[PDB]
């Protein structure tokens, strides 16, 4: 089997991407944030504290003839941005782009933090990291990809995120019309439960490429590119007037600037992030200070190849017995 679904930016900055997902019988369609940095499929629901729902579409398990309470199971998750959610668990039928999993754990939120409430466009998350990170207790549950894997034509999914435009998540096949050149594959460590790999270096604009190993994660659920402070300083030094602002929380630059590109290495290959992809617009409405899309990871504990980096490539998440990542230009 295979599946193919369009993913759409939630706003004009590509802050995140939503993909429609069918849950239950008859189908309830919710728009979920596919997150290769976490491993829980959770949704706003009829159980979510009413004051914490503000425009999201909810899953109502009592209206699904295939929903079953997973007795005793609870979940609770906190994300790198400080947001969180928790609740109980149902199993139900879940389909993405024509690909159906029966018995998928659907984690029903009883509570969500303010950032989730305030974003009416995201009805939940669909985690695509490794199932060892799933938070269901006392019986850990599998991701949608892990459950679908055996049925897929090939044990892979691909992320093809658009710049200010829709893109595609495919499951079970590699669309050879979606990229240019060849795909370069690179080793993955699953020791932390992430799609963790080592970039071979970087360049700023037309500058020379610096060969240096940068360990980080491919994370579709993170907006920006978080890299070591040395690398980030080298990038922003090429932008007149750019500075790190503790009050704003990162590097800012004059909105009048033209940003240089940023290149990262995948083995001997190179992925080029155009400068425009690094512009996240005014820090507040009407400001002439703009927020940068490349930021320091020094406060995180890990480097994160988020959407800014991933949307410059066609990305293969290879879930074979020895997982690997593949990157192609497009």
Swiss-Prot record:
UniProt-annotated catalytic positions: 35, 199
Superkingdom of source: Eukaryota
Catalysed reactions, semicolon-separated: Hydrolysis of proteins with specificity similar to that of pepsin A, prefers hydrophobic residues at P1 and P1', but does not cleave 14-Ala-|-Leu-15 in the B chain of insulin or Z-Glu-Tyr. Clots milk
Entry's Gene Ontology BP terms: proteolysis
GO terms assigned for molecular function: aspartic-type endopeptidase activity
Covalent S-S links between cysteines: 255-290
Protein name per Swiss-Prot or TrEMBL: Endothiapepsin
Name of the gene: EAPA
Keyword vocabulary terms for this entry: Aspartyl protease, Disulfide bond, Hydrolase, Protease, Signal, Zymogen
Stated family: Belongs to the peptidase A1 family.
Assigned EC number: 3.4.23.22
